[PDB]
Amino acid sequence: GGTIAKVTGPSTGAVGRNIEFSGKDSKDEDGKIVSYDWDFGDGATSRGKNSVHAYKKAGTYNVTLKVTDDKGATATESFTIEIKN
Prior knowledge:
Blueprint: E1 12-14, E2 18-22, E3 33-39, E4 45-47, E5 50-54, E6 59-69, E7 74-84
Parallel strand pairs: 1-7
Antiparallel strand pairs: 2-5, 3-4, 3-6, 6-7
PDB class: hydrolase
Keywords: polycystic kidney disease domain, collagen recognition domain
Assembly: monomeric
């Protein structure tokens, strides 16, 4: 009930194009979020509230964001993106 991850991005994209994802709307109800860990669903990862990824192959990818708060609690949320050739 405290901390929530939120993922903002496009539901579709194209192979080879840089796609911007944001965690900006993530929240700790009683403190601050200190880190943003992304997994783009193709083995790639990144850190930072606003992160970027290009997919190398068509597919449907489940992007996850794990946020950590200033109490060390974590929360994860998912976002599905369909990448066409």
